[PDB]
Amino acid sequence: PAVESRLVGGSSICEGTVEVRQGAQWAALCDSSSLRWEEVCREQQCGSVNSYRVLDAGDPTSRGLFCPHQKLSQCHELWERNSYCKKVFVTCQD
C-alpha cells in the first residue's frame, strides 16, 4: 500500500496541515526539501507548492507519523513519533 497524503484544515484542499496514511488511520506527518511538498500538492491535483511552515515545535503532546526518506512515494513503512512531532502546513497554488 502506498503512502497517501492530504492537506487538512485549510480553506481549500490545496492548503493545510499534512496528513498521511498507509494501511491506516490518518495521522499528521512529522518532518525535518521542497521536493516532498511538491509531490504532496500534486497528489491533491492542485498546483505547485507555494509555501510551508513548520508547526507545533516544542509541544510534547504533538504526535504523528514519520518517514525517514526524502520522498513519501519511497516509504515502505511509516514510523510513529508520539511526542514532539513537528507538523507541516503546506499551501499549494490552485
From Swiss-Prot:
It comes from the Eukaryota. Residues 5-93 form the SRCR domain. It is found in: Cell membrane. Disulfide bonds join 14-46, 30-85, 41-92, 67-75. Phosphorylated on serine, threonine and tyrosine residues following TCR stimulation. Interacts with CD72/LYB-2. Interacts with PTPN6/SHP-1. Interacts with CBL. Interacts with CD5L. Interacts with CD3Z/CD247. Lymphoid-specific receptor expressed by all T-cells and in a subset of B-cells known as B1a cells. Plays a role in the regulation of TCR and BCR signaling, thymocyte selection, T-cell effector differentiation and immune tolerance. Acts by interacting with several ligands expressed on B-cells such as CD5L or CD72 and thereby plays an important role in contact-mediated, T-dependent B-cell activation and in the maintenance of regulatory T and B-cell homeostasis. This is T-cell surface glycoprotein CD5. It comes from Homo sapiens (Human). The gene is CD5. The chain holds residues 276 to 368 of 495 of the full protein.
